[PDB]
Amino acid sequence: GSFVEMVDNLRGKSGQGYYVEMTVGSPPQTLNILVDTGSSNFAVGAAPHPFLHRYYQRQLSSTYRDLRKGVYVPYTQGKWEGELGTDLVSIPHGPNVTVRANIAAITESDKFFINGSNWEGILGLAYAEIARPDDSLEPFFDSLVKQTHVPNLFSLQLCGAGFPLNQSEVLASVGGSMIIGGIDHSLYTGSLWYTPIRREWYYEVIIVRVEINGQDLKMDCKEYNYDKSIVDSGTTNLRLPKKVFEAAVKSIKAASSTEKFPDGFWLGEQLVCWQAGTTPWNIFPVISLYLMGEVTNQSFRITILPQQYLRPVEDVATSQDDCYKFAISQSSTGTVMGAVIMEGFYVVFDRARKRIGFAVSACHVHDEFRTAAVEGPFVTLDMEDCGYNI
């Protein structure tokens, strides 16, 4: 129903991440923590770093327990390494509970912490299968559910401003909500539609059809989920498999052909600017992703606007122009529904019923002519064939 204590508990933006305040140790040490549905470790800065103004000090926590085990995590865009342990953890604008959770105390990292992001760690909300070093390291949410009466469900409303927020504004602005243990009806409009969680590792889903301004991309649906499709608040962009990316960009270019943009724009590298207030939203198409429904041979669609897939960025000249980066990019690891897609919707991670819910977000950016949408049902056949198998 209503979870006023957790509403508006997030800050941040799509490019730098959305974070929630947490406390670790006794006495409590306050830290800002990235909400990451694409990983499964609770990992916090525990040693000085040039981009950290605070970190977890294990020697100051009376409830700190050393697990005597290291963790080394090299990833595509960087690396983090640290020491495993446990401590008492709370979410000040969350359920009124304290849990004993695993913590990876980050002692060394490369390109992990973002200068100016305002977060000092990450909260991996996905399942134990992808926890590092292995699945025996119980993720935070699993500990929270096992130790308390908190229902096995969380929901996220990520709120993009629709324009750039400077250093001061991003610290003072409400970035959205993470409702732990429930669904808050004030965060969305219309109905919630659910897609099954295909498998519990990442939050894996199945896309069955893709349209650009109602025109079917017409690919074998297995291509859309090659090698998987996930919902990931820990990624900025909508990331698409190489072949799907190439087809989608061709169609988005064709729909917006009244204006030509340089190659660097479509590569997500360079910004495009328009005179203040003149962004031609109407020339860019809407993108509909059809997801497998909970009923046999039924699907539903989520429709996003260019106000979601064009990410607002401030100009190099700090001008009065309205500038953006194209927030759709290619992937070699499947589809990733990142922060820019999540900004259009209230997303319900219903772990108890192995399903993900989508509803139009009460804070999605739109114009007077178009809105994001969550609609259904549609008759869709052979949807299990859309799932990829190695």
Ligand SMILES: CN1C(=N)N[C@](c2ccccc2)(c2cccc(NC(=O)c3ccco3)c2)C1=O
């Ligand atoms: C894709 N992805 C993710 N889902 N989480 C990782 C991660 C986490 C643990 C271990 C390996 C990789 C990450 C690591 C560091 C930062 C961010 N996220 C951001 O900086 C960010 C910005 C906007 C949204 O998220 C995400 C990552 O690679």
